[PDB]
Amino acid sequence: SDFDLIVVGSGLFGLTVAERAASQLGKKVLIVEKRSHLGGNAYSEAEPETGIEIHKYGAHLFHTSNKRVWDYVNQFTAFTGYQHRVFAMHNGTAYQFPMGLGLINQFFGRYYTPDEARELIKEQSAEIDSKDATNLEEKAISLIGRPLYEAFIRDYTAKQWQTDPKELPAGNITRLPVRYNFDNRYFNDTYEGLPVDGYAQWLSNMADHENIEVRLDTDWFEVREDLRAQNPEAPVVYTGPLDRYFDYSEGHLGWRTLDFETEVLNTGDFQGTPVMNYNDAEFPYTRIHEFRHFHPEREDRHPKDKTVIMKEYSRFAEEGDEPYYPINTPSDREMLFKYRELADAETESGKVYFGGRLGTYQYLDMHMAIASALSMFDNKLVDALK
Amino acid sequence: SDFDLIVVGSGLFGLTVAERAASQLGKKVLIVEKRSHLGGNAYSEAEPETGIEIHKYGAHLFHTSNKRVWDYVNQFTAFTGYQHRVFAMHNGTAYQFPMGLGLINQFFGRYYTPDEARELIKEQSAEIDSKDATNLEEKAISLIGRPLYEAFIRDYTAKQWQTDPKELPAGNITRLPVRYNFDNRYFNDTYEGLPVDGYAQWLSNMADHENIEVRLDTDWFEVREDLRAQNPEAPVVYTGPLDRYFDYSEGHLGWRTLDFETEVLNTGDFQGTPVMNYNDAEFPYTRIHEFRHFHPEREDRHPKDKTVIMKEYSRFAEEGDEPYYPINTPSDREMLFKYRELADAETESGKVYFGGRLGTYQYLDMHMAIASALSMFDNKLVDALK
Ligand SMILES: Cc1cc2nc3c(=O)[nH]c(=O)nc-3n(C[C@H](O)[C@H](O)[C@H](O)COP(=O)(O)OP(=O)(O)OC[C@H]3O[C@@H](n4cnc5c(N)ncnc54)[C@H](O)[C@@H]3O)c2cc1C
Numbered sequence: 001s002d003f004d005l006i007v008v009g010s011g012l013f014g015l016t017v018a019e020r021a022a023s024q025l026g027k028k029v030l031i032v033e034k035r036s037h038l039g040g041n042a043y044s045e046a047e048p049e050t051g052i053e054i055h056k057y058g059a060h061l062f063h064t065s066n067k068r069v070w071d072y073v074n075q076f077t078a079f080t081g082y083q084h085r086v087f088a089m090h091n092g093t094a095y096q097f098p099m100g101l102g103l104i105n106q107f108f109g110r111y112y113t114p115d116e117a118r119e120l121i122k123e124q125s126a127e128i129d130s131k132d133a134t135n136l137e138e139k140a141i142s143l144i145g146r147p148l149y150e151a152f153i154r155d156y157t158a159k160q161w162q163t164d165p166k167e168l169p170a171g172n173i174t175r176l177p178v179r180y181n182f183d184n185r186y187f188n189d190t191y192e193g194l195p196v197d198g199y200a201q202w203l204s205n206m207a208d209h210e211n212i213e214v215r216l217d218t219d220w221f222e223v224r225e226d227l228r229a230q231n232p233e234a235p236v237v238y239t240g241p242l243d244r245y246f247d248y249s250e251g252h253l254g255w256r257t258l259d260f261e262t263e264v265l266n267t268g269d270f271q272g273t274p275v276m277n278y279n280d281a282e283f284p285y286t287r288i289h290e291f292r293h294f295h296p297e298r299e300d301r302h303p304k305d306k307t308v309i310m311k312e313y314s315r316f317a318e319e320g321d322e323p324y325y326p327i328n329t330p331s332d333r334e335m336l337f338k339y340r341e342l343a344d345a346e347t348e349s350g351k352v353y354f355g356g357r358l359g360t361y362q363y364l365d366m367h368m369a370i371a372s373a374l375s376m377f378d379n380k381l382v383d384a385l386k
Numbered sequence: 387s388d389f390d391l392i393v394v395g396s397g398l399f400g401l402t403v404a405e406r407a408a409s410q411l412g413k414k415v416l417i418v419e420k421r422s423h424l425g426g427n428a429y430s431e432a433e434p435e436t437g438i439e440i441h442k443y444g445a446h447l448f449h450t451s452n453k454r455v456w457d458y459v460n461q462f463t464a465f466t467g468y469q470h471r472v473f474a475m476h477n478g479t480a481y482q483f484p485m486g487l488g489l490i491n492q493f494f495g496r497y498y499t500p501d502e503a504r505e506l507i508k509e510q511s512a513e514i515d516s517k518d519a520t521n522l523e524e525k526a527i528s529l530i531g532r533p534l535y536e537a538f539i540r541d542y543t544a545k546q547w548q549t550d551p552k553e554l555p556a557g558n559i560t561r562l563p564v565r566y567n568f569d570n571r572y573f574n575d576t577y578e579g580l581p582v583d584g585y586a587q588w589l590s591n592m593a594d595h596e597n598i599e600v601r602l603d604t605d606w607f608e609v610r611e612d613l614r615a616q617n618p619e620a621p622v623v624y625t626g627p628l629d630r631y632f633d634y635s636e637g638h639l640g641w642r643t644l645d646f647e648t649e650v651l652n653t654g655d656f657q658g659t660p661v662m663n664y665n666d667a668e669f670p671y672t673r674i675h676e677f678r679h680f681h682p683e684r685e686d687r688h689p690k691d692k693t694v695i696m697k698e699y700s701r702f703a704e705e706g707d708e709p710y711y712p713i714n715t716p717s718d719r720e721m722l723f724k725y726r727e728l729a730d731a732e733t734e735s736g737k738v739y740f741g742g743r744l745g746t747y748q749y750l751d752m753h754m755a756i757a758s759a760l761s762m763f764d765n766k767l768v769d770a771l772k
């Protein structure tokens with residue numbers, strides 16, 4: 001046949017499943033993608049005026065402690081030695097971040113040793129027992145105290161969720177967000193970096209295989225009857241929206257979206273760092289990204305007098321908006337269980353598997369999407385494609 | 387013969403010359419080393435109570451932009467992804483360091499953008515023109531201004547040199563010590579790390595070759611007549627003290643030394659970072675090293691409740707003291723030129739080559755010693771050993 005497997009969507013989940021089927025099982029794979037490009041939200045492109053690599057669906061930082069995933073992705077791109085670090089802007093000062101000896105010194109006014117900082121945090125957080133916390137605000141305070149909470153957590157959290165933290169689940173915070181050393185590596189994973197030649201080259205390399213066909217600007221729901229009629233026995237891996245697949249018969253699942261305001265400025269350097277969080281309520285955006293600093297190794301390709309920045313705004317996703325983060329209200333959770341039952345039945349009757357962020361209503365980092373795809377490949381697809 | 391080449395001293399210079407002769411030319415090499423161990427001042431060992439790797443002749447951080455050197459050293463050890471970062475303690479606060487947007491924010495009280503910081507530094511340093519500076523103090527001020535100079539440079543410099551900075555050469559500072567971003571990577575080199583299994587294993591691996599013989603606890607000057615009589619034609623590479631070699635006939639070259647006060651403390655973490663500079667005159671030491679943080683990858687081998695620190699003191703090297711840094715007074719420079727003429731004559735008459743830190747009265751980082759040895763090998767020894 002012209003294809004043995006159909007993959008709907010070319011995000012990291014779809015790309016991984018397609019590439020494994022193509023290279024490991026020698027199967028012909030047809031990837032159907034609704035957008036004008038590969039890669040889903042991880043896709044990046046050159047900003048036209050400066051040439052700087054930017055993102056239109058959020059900044060993407062790759063990090064993992066999963067060696068299998070790391071070895072896998074390095075087949076398709078090399079990674080720089082980039083390490084993500086973040087600064088937090090509060091009341092006109094850029095704080096070291098996450099919370100640690102650095103921020104603590106800056107905020108409380110003098111140097112605290114590791115042991116002194118431990119003592120300080122116990123004093124500050126004595127007010128509420130975490131076992132007694134009834135919401136996010138209390139849970140935060142019970143861990144780090146009011147001054148730190150009110151300075152670095154309250155408004156940022158309020159902006160991201162568009163909710164007062166007194167109305168958010170105590171379960172949103174599950175561990176002490178404080179380090180008792182000067183380590184401000186943002187992520188804690190064994191492996192970390194950025195694709196040496198950008199995300200677009202990486203994701204394009206994954207789909208670059210003699211056994212893989214890609215059709216861009218193509219909506220699955222507009223072509224599915226025709227495609228499946230060409231080879232009825234070919235299974236489908238669907239990574240589009242789960243609720244949309246079943247005509248919203250159980251309601252619309254709720255998502256958070258993001259707005260990005262991207263500007264080219266007439267300076268070579270706007271903030272001297274890739275990411276600056278804006279922790280104060282007076283700034284409507286949560287953070288500013290300055291894209292050139294994600295790739296300092298490209299400096300003599302970047303302009304000396306211009307830079308691209310991007311302000312990030314969070315809100316509830318309405319019709320038209322890109323769905324990014326599942327909200328997971330108990331209503332959402334309940335119509336999700338209903339959709340899982342429909343999906344499971346569809347797999348049994350129609351050989352349609354459901355995966356990825358949209359297909360399963362679950363936020364997935366890139367390495368988690370890849371791991372999830374590798375698992376579906378191993379445990380489901382190898383058998384379905386015999 | 388039993389040896390084709392004699393190398394005096396097993397620092398990185400000697401080890402490199404010995405290993406190249408052994409492996410590239412297939413020559414028998416005898417290394418004579420006065421101390422009880424290999425590796426010179428780069429040698430490290432386990433502290434007995436904690437097991438933590440420590441140094442007795444200074445902390446050693448490996449970094450280079452020389453790819454040949456990098457490829458070379460990686461034949462003998464793997465390196466961790468350690469990146470050196472330093473903090474500067476001033477008036478009870480730990481500052482981000484070197485001078486950059488971080489320190490500037492902390493010191494001047496609010497956030498300065500890259501362009502604002504550039505403007506600030508021009509205002510601060512307007513007082514003196516660097517072309518008009520007559521000493522170190524003025525040269526420093528002409529670059530960064532009095533407040534920064536007096537906070538972070540004056541006393542530290544005074545402690546290291548045991549001299550008032552008004553009495554030091556304007557030539558000691560040659561570039562703007564200020565970064566206009568938040569990058570606090572301490573070194574600027576392409577390659578950086580620490581030997582995965584410690585320096586002792588690395589340096590021992592270099593000398594581990596079927597063609598290499600090592601005699602520890604052996605002073606060249608006590609054995610040289612006997613050794614050379616066994617094979618008169620074998621050249622010598624001498625990396626011992628240059629002035630001592632010629633019986634101080636032209637005077638004693640002046641060196642700076644260091645005292646180290648090493649303590650085991652009953653806490654798991656003393657300062658939460660590998661190196662804390664003490665910039666204030668009230669502390670007699672220049673900095674404290676906390677050795678466990680050079681190898682965070684070894685954390686579950688390190689004790690949870692103990693840590694080794696080391697305070698560093700600088701002074702002029704007297705009889706007995708380990709000579710570490712050449713002072714280079716014009717007197718020194720003049721008796722050095724005299725010694726260079728003697729050395730050059732000795733090479734011609736006795737086939738004794740002079741190299742390394744002590745052999746040439748010049749401070750050398752590890753990669754610079756290696757490069758210098760590789761060069762002596764290439765340009766001198768290959769011909770001398772035919
Ligand atoms: C704002 C944001 C920031 C992120 N930052 C990071 C980060 O820093 N680090 C990290 O590891 N991960 C990050 N991620 C996650 C990362 O993008 C994952 O790769 C992804 O979210 C999950 O994998 P996926 O393939 O299922 O999803 P997707 O990327 O959503 O891919 C699904 C694809 O299916 C296509 N599709 C949908 N419906 C149809 C249809 N009917 N027909 C055809 N095609 C269709 C879509 O157009 C899309 O290309 C971020 C995600 C977002 C949204």
Ligand SMILES: Cc1cc2nc3c(=O)[nH]c(=O)nc-3n(C[C@H](O)[C@H](O)[C@H](O)COP(=O)(O)OP(=O)(O)OC[C@H]3O[C@@H](n4cnc5c(N)ncnc54)[C@H](O)[C@@H]3O)c2cc1C
Pocket residue numbers: 394395396397398399400418419420421424425426427428443444445446447448449604605606607625626627644710711741742743744745750751752753755
């Ligand atoms: C305090 C300090 C800190 C340093 N920190 C760093 C750092 O962070 N990064 C970096 O890259 N470099 C650092 N270095 C430099 C590093 O140690 C170099 O490897 C070295 O200084 C230069 O190489 P070398 O082989 O000539 O010297 P050495 O290390 O001095 O080796 C010379 C050897 O010759 C031996 N010897 C002397 N006389 C005789 C004799 N008569 N007979 C036999 N043997 C003899 C000595 O015992 C010694 O083992 C530091 C050095 C010091 C002193």
Ligand SMILES: O=c1ccn([C@@H]2O[C@H](COP(=O)(O)OP(=O)(O)O[C@H]3O[C@H](CO)[C@@H](O)[C@H](O)[C@H]3O)[C@@H](O)[C@H]2O)c(=O)[nH]1
Pocket residue numbers: 061088152153154156157160277279365
């Ligand atoms: O300055 C800050 C930063 C974070 N938070 C709190 O932490 C939460 C998470 O903050 P966010 O900025 O989204 O952190 P990220 O590390 O960027 O997390 C997202 O993006 C990561 C990219 O890899 C993923 O690992 C995570 O799963 C995903 O939630 C927020 O909602 C707040 O409650 C603050 O209060 N203040």
Ligand SMILES: O=c1ccn([C@@H]2O[C@H](COP(=O)(O)OP(=O)(O)O[C@H]3O[C@H](CO)[C@@H](O)[C@H](O)[C@H]3O)[C@@H](O)[C@H]2O)c(=O)[nH]1
Pocket residue numbers: 447474538539540542543546663665751
């Ligand atoms: O907090 C500080 C640090 C440095 N200095 C000035 O900078 C000079 C150098 O300081 P130092 O602490 O010795 O810097 P290092 O980077 O440790 O330099 C030594 O050790 C490095 C280890 O790789 C080598 O690269 C260098 O050549 C060697 O001089 C001092 O004398 C001061 O004049 C200050 O004023 N304040």
Ligand code: NA
Pocket residue numbers: 125126127128129130141142143
């Ligand atoms: Na508490």
Ligand code: NA
Pocket residue numbers: 511512513514515516527528529
């Ligand atoms: Na000036």
